[PDB]
């Protein structure tokens, strides 16, 4: 002790930036009467230190003056969560009785010495969250008594040593955040007691070893975010204890092995972001424990098997971004726990099944860019748990007020590019959590129900390219949280409400291709975030108000195809960020204000088909203007 | 994806009292359905309209991961810290609006790689240093403003800056 205690005390002297409130204030008397009872972090057997525990003590220093020659009986060493810097000495391999070695969460650098391989009594090795570099020494394979190795979040390079096949007692192998290289050693498939194998987020190349079919005890296999190639070995189906299988973000090829259906314990399966091809094996319907099934972003083809109706515990089904085709089998939506159904970016056909929301738990449903047709099933109308619903780009049909019910939890919905008809039901107001209502390019008619403006939480509203009638009320001001407002391409009439003044958060306004009939509100001068305003193809009938020139942030402003008259106010020179102007097809008169030469951001102008006269101020926009941009004026010099 | 993870990184470095960044759902494939972000036809981010958002915090180097980001509007906020030189990785770039903030430190010399830059406004800040010579080689810059900043050094008219007027350099303590 007295030699051990004095040797430890000499090492404590190396510590830097240590305050008097440190836990190591207890290291005072080198006599055994206090060394083995009152020194923080030390424990003795027969009066000799066997245990050194200094986790999370705030020590800053090095192991250079660690008393290797003075502590022969160390069997438990934890120095994690400190500020130790330097390298791992080969002397660490001298502690013949050591069983637990932890130097995680530190600032160590350099290679791992081969001498660590001669710690024949070691049970657990932790070197986590350091900056160690080099290749793992082959001598680590001498640790026949080890059960857990964790060296993840480091700068390790080179291959995994094939000598690891000698570590028969290993149950846990954690090496994920690293830069290991080469093929997986096939001896790793022969570890009998292995339970968890995490090799994800590395630079591994080559095929998955077919010997992995021997790992009858492994429940977790993380190898995602690698450069694995070839095909998934069918022998993986012999891994009858496997719970989670994640090979996502790799360069695997070929079809899914039909032998995945043998693993009755498999609950999670991530195969996404790869290059697998072929058709979905019908045997995948026999993965009875399956909960999370993800095959997104691949090159799969063919129909989904009806056997998916046997997956009674399925909650997430990710099949998006593939080349699957045909109709959806009703078995897909059989699960009462089904919560997420992502199917966009595919080549499907036909109708949605009536099982779509059988359990009443479906949250997210995505069908973008497919060839679905027919009406909305009744189970989806009455499904109240919807959060995200994406129907964009299909041939769906039916009455829009008869298709959809009430959704208290609805957050986002996009029904654009479809064939819905009818008039909007006021039921949408009850979806008080909705923030995005996007319904463009449909056959919808009628007037906008007034209750829509009472949806205060709405931030984006897109009813463009429809046949909606009526006029916008002054209650338009109720939705001031809006930032994108797209009502263009409709049959909206009457005057533009001055309540648009109070929608301050507005970034993007599109009211063009409509039938607005009276003069522009002079009070639209307080939109400090608007960069876009399009009022083209309407019936506005007076002079451009001076309030428009006060919106500093406009980038584009299109007032074309109107009955606007009067003179072009020179105060448009104030719009310092304006890049585009279009005033064509109007009855504007007078001369173009010569102050416009100072609009350096202006790049595109059109003034054609008007009643103006005089020479053009000289700027970049006017010089590059084509002859169309001045057509049909009176006396433009 | 990669662009969404980068904008998620910004979302974690800014204190958002006004709940502007709420729509920035990180588990989406692309951030193109988020608010205040607009994409082109290829689902690559081209605009970030975060002006006057009452955001507080520090910028994040991951802002250089938007190759197609043409307009970056972070003006009129209480953001602090420095300008990370990784913004020079914005190969396609038109507008840089960081004015009206609490930013400090130098003007990274890496901004000379944004040869497409038209508008650069950094006024009303705590920036300190000298104007890099690299900014003189862009030849696309049209509108420039470094007012209300405690910089130093003489006004660098190396050719491109020949067209600019003292309002661009007013209250700068340059000379």
């Amino acid at each position: 002790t007295v030699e051990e205690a004095n040797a430890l005390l000499k090492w404590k002297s190396t510590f830097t930036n240590q305050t008097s409130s440190s836990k190591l204030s207890s290291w005072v008397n080198p006599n055994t009467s206090s060394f083995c009872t009152s020194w923080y972090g030390v424990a003795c057997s027969l009066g000799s230190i066997i245990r050194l525990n200094l986790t999370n003590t705030g020590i800053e220093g090095t192991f250079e003056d660690f008393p290797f020659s003075s502590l022969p009986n160390l069997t438990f060493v934890d120095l994690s969560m400190n500020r130790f810097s330097g390298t791992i000495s080969p002397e660490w391999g001298r502690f013949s009785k050591l069983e637990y070695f932890d130097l995680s969460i530190n600032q160590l650098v350099g290679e791992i010495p081969p001498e660590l391989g001669k710690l024949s009594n070691l049970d657990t090795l932790h070197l986590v969250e350091n900056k160690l570099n080099g290749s793992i020494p082959s001598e680590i394979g001498r640790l026949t008594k080890v059960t857990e190795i964790a060296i993840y979040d480091n700068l390790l390079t080179g291959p995994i040593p094939s000598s690891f096949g000698n570590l028969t007692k290993l149950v846990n192998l954690y090496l994920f955040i690293n830069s290991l290289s080469g093929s997986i050693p096939s001896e790793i498939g022969n570890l009998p007691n292995l339970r968890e194998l995490c090799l994800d987020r590395n630079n591994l190349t080559g095929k998955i070893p077919s010997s992995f079919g021997n790992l009858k005890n492994v429940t977790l296999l993380n190898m995602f975010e690698n450069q694995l190639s070839g095909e998934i070995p069918p022998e993986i189906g012999n891994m009858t204890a496997l719970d989670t299988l994640s090979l996502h973000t790799n360069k695997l090829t070929g079809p899914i092995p039909s032998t995945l259906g043998n693993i009755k314990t498999l609950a999670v399966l991530h195969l996404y972001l790869n290059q697998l091809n072929g058709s979905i094996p019908p045997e995948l319907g026999e993965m009875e424990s399956m909960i999370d099934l993800e095959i997104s972003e691949n090159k799969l083809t063919g129909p989904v098997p009806d056997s998916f109706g046997k997956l009674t515990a399925l909650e997430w089904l990710f099949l998006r971004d593939n080349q699957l085709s045909g109709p959806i089998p009703p078995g897909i939506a059989n699960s009462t726990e089904l919560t997420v159904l992502q199917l966009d970016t595919n080549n499907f056909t036909g109708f949605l099944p009536d099982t779509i929301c059988r359990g009443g738990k479906l949250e997210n449903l995505t069908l973008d860019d497919n060839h679905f047709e027919g009406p909305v099933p009744k189970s989806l109308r009455d499904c109240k748990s919807l959060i995200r619903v994406r129907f964009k780009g299909n041939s769906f049909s039916g009455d829009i007020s008869e298709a959809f019910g009430v959704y208290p939890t609805l957050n986002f919905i996009d029904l654009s590019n479809n064939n819905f008809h009818g008039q909007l039901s006021a039921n949408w107001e009850q979806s008080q959590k909705l923030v995005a209502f996007i319904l463009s390019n449909n056959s919808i008619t009628g007037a906008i129900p007034p209750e829509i403006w009472n949806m205060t939480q709405l931030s984006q509203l897109d009813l463009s390219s429809n046949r909606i009638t009526g006029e916008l009320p002054e209650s338009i001001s109720n939705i001031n949280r809006i930032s994108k407002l797209q009502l263009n391409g409709n049959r909206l009439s009457g005057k533009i409400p001055s309540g648009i003044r109070l929608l301050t958060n507005l970034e993007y306004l599109d009211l063009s291709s409509n039938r607005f009939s009276f003069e522009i509100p002079p009070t639209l001068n307080n939109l400090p975030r608007l960069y876009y305003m399009n009022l083209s193809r309407n019936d506005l009938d007076q002079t451009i108000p001076e309030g428009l020139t006060k919106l500093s942030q406009l980038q584009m402003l299109d007032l074309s195809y109107n009955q606007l008259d009067g003179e072009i106010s020179s105060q448009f020179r104030s719009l310092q960020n304006l890049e585009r102007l279009d005033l064509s097809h109007n009855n504007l008169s007078g001369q173009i204000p010569p102050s416009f030469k100072d609009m350096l951001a202006l790049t595109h102008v059109d003034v054609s088909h008007n009643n103006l006269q005089g020479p053009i101020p000289d700027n970049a926009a006017f010089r590059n203007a084509p002859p169309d941009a001045f057509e049909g004026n009176k006396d433009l010099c | 994806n990669a662009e969404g993870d980068a904008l998620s990184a910004l979302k974690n470095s800014l204190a958002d009292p006004n709940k502007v960044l709420q729509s920035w759902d990180a588990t989406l494939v692309t951030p193109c359905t988020w608010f205040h972000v607009t994409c082109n036809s290829d689902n690559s981010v081209t605009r970030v309209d975060l002006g006057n958002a009452n955001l507080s915090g520090q910028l994040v180097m991951q802002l250089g991961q938007l190759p197609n980001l043409q307009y970056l509007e972070l003006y009129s906020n209480n953001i602090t810290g420095t300008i990370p030189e990784q913004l020079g990785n914005l190969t396609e770039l038109v507008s840089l609006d960081l004015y009206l903030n609490n930013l400090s430190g130098p003007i990274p010399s890496t901004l000379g790689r944004l040869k497409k830059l038209r508008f650069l406004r950094l006024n009303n800040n705590s920036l300190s240093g000298e104007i890099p010579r690299s900014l003189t080689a862009v030849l696309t810059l049209q509108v420039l403003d470094l007012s209300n900043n405690p910089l130093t050094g003489d006004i660098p008219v190396n050719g491109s800056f020949s067209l600019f007027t003292p309002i661009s350099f007013a209250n700068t303590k340059l000379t």
């Binding site: 964790a150 997104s296 990710f318 | 588990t27």
Partner: peptide, 13 residues
């Protein structure tokens, strides 16, 4: 504490 890595979910639309 030493933990095992968790697989992250696929991106949704």
């Amino acid at each position: 504490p030493v933990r095992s890595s968790q697989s992250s979910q696929a991106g949704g639309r």
